[model samples]
Structure formats: structure tokens, C-alpha cells
Target: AEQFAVGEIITDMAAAAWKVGLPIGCIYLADMNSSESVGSDAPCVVKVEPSDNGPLFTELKFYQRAAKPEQIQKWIRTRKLKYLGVPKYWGSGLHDKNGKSYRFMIMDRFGSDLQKIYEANAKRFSRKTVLQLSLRILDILEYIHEHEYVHGDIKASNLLLNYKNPDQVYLVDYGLAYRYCPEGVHKAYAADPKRCHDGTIEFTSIDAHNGVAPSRRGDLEILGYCMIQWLTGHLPWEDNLKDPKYVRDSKIRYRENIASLMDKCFPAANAPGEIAKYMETVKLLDYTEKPLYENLRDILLQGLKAIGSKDDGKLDL
Candidate 1:
């Protein structure tokens, strides 16, 4: 078999499996239901090969409208972020077979699903273990945000924990992510405006539910909420139906409802000294003052109490 060229488009994108030369195997870069679409110029798929020759990869992104590849390149350059975790651009073009055109972007695959690992390790993970996992996720989010991108969706399913080294966590899905401009984009925070709410409902912030564009605060808020859910295995909202309006309203109600509930249900579990210290340290909910690990652990404990009580259970604390 001949070695694949850097820009060569494989005849079948799906056929580039591990057996077909992919080192870690083929994985879908974007969720099928992702609403955002790139234009024809975007590279849609990518593969990495680390054989005797050397380690190299390819990137493909599809475009649904006219876009400049240089813009994407510029974003990467301006942010000083490396695309090696994902993929650098290999080549991009339109697929015109049978007189029809389609667009796609391909990129390098990095990390494995943490949800899968969580399931496998559920029996082994203690409360401390869960806290550590949540900490790793927060660390990754902190690094990602430092680069100026809001990871639009922050859910367990989207989190990728390295298979080889569980401590290495990667925030993988970026289809819904946006380049955040804090001072420049005030429209997202305007008192009232219509905007697209794009993210996983379970891990979205209150502002996100109201059509506000994503922000660092919103990302942190959602992550704080999710850290709680991850530790306790329950979401603040009870209803699991997928209606956007209902979900939006439910989230508002849920946030309000957690205040009193956190006080009543949380303080009972481990050492009283530790619990008291945690309460005193984290009562403010100040994103800046609290360290990511401590904040997540406290949030997790509080959420565990609130949701657990509502579900006909009490917190061990």
C-alpha cells in the first residue's frame, strides 16, 4: 500500500478506520445533530498517522457558506493556541459527485470519552475520586478559557479523559464553541435581545437559557452546576423532557430553589470540621476568589443535598 499524502482526500471518509491506517481509529469529530455548519472551504475530517516515517496529521472542515480558511488560521494564530490536540489544516475542497455538492471539515482525533471511563470505574471511584475527576475537568476548562474560547457545551459526554493517562483531561468538542470577546460583545448581555442558545441543556447557564451569547461567567456557572451533578448523579431540574422552553423555565426555577435547600441538606456527611470549613470557604460563590477545585467540590456537595432531598433521599452529610 502506498503512503497517504498530506492533502490527499481519502476516497471514503468513514473508511479511514484503524485497519485502514488511522493510529487511534476513526472517530466522528462533530455530533450529527450539531446546528453549526461550516462552508465548503472548511476542512471537515482529519487523521493522524504515527508510523515509522514520522508523526503527522490532516484536517478537514466543511463550510455551508462562504468563509475564509485564513480566518480560521488567523484565529488559531491570534489565540496562540495549538491545534495539534485536534488537527492542523491539511486541505479543503468541495465534493461534487453525481452533480451534488457537500461540505465537511476533518480534523485530528484526541482523547477518549470520559463517560465510558466513568462507567467502567464507577465501582472503584470514591467520593474523593469523583472530586479529583471534577478538579481535572475544571483545570482543563480554566486553560481553555485562558485562550479566549468558550467551550459552548460542557457535559460529561463531551469531556474526553485520556485512556493512557486518566489524569490528562481534554475538552474536545468545539463545534459550538465561540471566540469570546468580553468587552467588545456587550449585545449578548443587553437587557433583552434574541440570540441563539447553543449548548447541552443539562449543563447550560441561566443566561444561556435566555438567549444570551456565551461568556466566561456563563461557562463557569454551568461548570459549577455540572460539577455538582457529576458528584451526586442528579441534575437540578427534575423533568427530563427536551422542550427548549420548558427546559429554560425549569432551570430558572431550579436555581432559585437551590438556595434554602443547600443550607438544609448539605452539612451532614463527613468530618464536621471539614464540612464547616467548606461551608465558610465557599458560601460566597465568588468565581474569582474560589479556587477551581474547592469551588467545584463545594458546589457538588450543595447540589447533592438539594437534588438528593427532592428525589426522596437525604445527603449523608
Candidate 2:
């Protein structure tokens, strides 16, 4: 697909104009409401792809269905949450560049991704920081799960901090999101070899590795792996990510014995009790069962309290 030109004015479906600024790798930074200068401080981004592309369409549908500004605000108020990190869908439209139609989505611009922060911090987060981040991630997972979608991908790189608030993190890139329950009917457990190992190799759930459709449990399982990596800087299979079967088998074996997995990952110290308990809780969930999200949050909250800290909403960068 041909890229949008810098300083070019692009119109959304609503007929509002946005001047494209810097290219953010694949997406472009764009000023709102047809500004003349595509300034460095643009508050929105436009993600453009061929109109026929499947993932872009999928992501567009998700933003349309669940990420509207009012919808998120209502959820946060009803749930008594400080804020919801889901990015708001600003606008989108088809732009024709040289006879080819490109679909673009306008969304809230974000700051650096967590993976960059993770590396900058020597690849290890303080235990308090991990629990704090996981707590918020659980909130995000519950919100999306309640909306009937499962984020098949959950890793540091996929999580971006809010541009204005460094403490807030938003989950992005819903190209692999799956509606596990459609019209309130949950999908049955079915594994297909053709679809196996479908997500980021290092952090995908065991169910994903087994070729089952992504589900709520799978999302939680992926988060558990993330917490382990954030705290200890390693997963048992990080060294062999080239082998899907090896990673899958390792996760399965670890699920069978949480202690051994903890021992393997946290070799120098006793594994964090809250994390082990969190994994144990996630392990017992049936494939189609709804998870007790509050319980999981409670586990992480306890982790915070153990360190003589509280949920003060500080990411501590």
C-alpha cells in the first residue's frame, strides 16, 4: 500500500480533515480537524492499510463496537474505576491514493510501549510495579472479556502508555482479537492443528499453542506469563522460542506443577507467593468457564500489600 504523504490532508468518513505528520513505523501521526501544520504534538494517529486487509477491518470493528469514548466512560463510572485504558476510536475513512483505496483509523496517540520501558529498566520490574501493572491489566481484560472479545495477544510491546499520563497503559493492536462468545453463546473447545501457535511465541497461552480459539482463560494465562517475565526477566522457554512444540510442552508441564515452574523461573529466590497462587487459580478454570476476575485482582493486591505498598496507581516508571 502506498503511504500517505507527510503534510497531506486526509479526510475521514465523517468528512473531517486530518493533516498527516510523522510516520509511526506503520501508522502516521496526524493533527486533528484539518490543521495546516502536521505538528510534532499531534494528539491522534491514522493507521492505513489496503481496504481489503483483514486485520485492519477486524480492528476497526472492535473500535467501533467497544472503544467509543462514552462507552468507556460509562464503564469506568459504573465500575468505580479511576480510568479505563482502552484507546478511544476518533474516526476512520477510506482514502484513495493513486487509484488504490486505503482504509485508515484515527485513534488516540500513545507514548512508548512497555517493552521499551522493560528493557530500559534492565528487563526487571520491581515486584510492586509488576503487581500494579498486572492489576490494571486485569481490569482491561475483564472489560474486553465482558464485551465478548478476547485479545489473543498480550505482551509488553502490545501495551502502550498514555501520552498524557505516564501511569496509564493501554492495550493496542486488536488484529488478532476473537469474539469467543457471539450473541451470548460461547464457543466450544476445539483445537485445530492448522491454526496452532497463532500468537507471539514467547507469551501466548497454552490454549493458543494447542490451536484452540482464544478465550477469557487464555487471556488470563497469557497475563500470568507476562507477570512472571516482568518480575523475574525470564520464562523457562524463552531460550527456545523457535520451537512452538517445545514452548507448548513446557507450559503444559509447568501448569501441572506450578511450584516447579516457579522454581525454574525464579531460581535465585523464592517465587512470589501471589503469582504462584494466581497461576494455580487460572489453571483450574474450565475452557468455557468465566473467571472470577476479582479474585485474581485480589491476588495481585495482596502482592502489593506484601511489599508494604497500596494500589496508589503509580507505575513508578
Q: Write down the TM-score of every candidate.
A: 0.54, 0.95
lDDT of 1 at 307: 34
Q: Which runs of model 2 end up more than 4 angstroms from their true locations?
A: 34-36, 191-197
Encode model 1's per-residue lDDT on 148-236: one tens digit a residue.
55666776667664433454455555545654543444333532333344577767866667776776666766665555555555554
> How does model 2 fare in lDDT?
0.88
The top-ranked prediction according to TM-score is 2
C-alpha positional error of residue 191 in candidate 1 after TM-score superposition, expressed in Å? 9.3
Give residue 4's error in model 1 in angstroms: 12
Relative to the true structure, how large is the alpha-carbon lDDT of every model?
0.45, 0.88
Cα-based lDDT at residue 102, candidate 1: 39
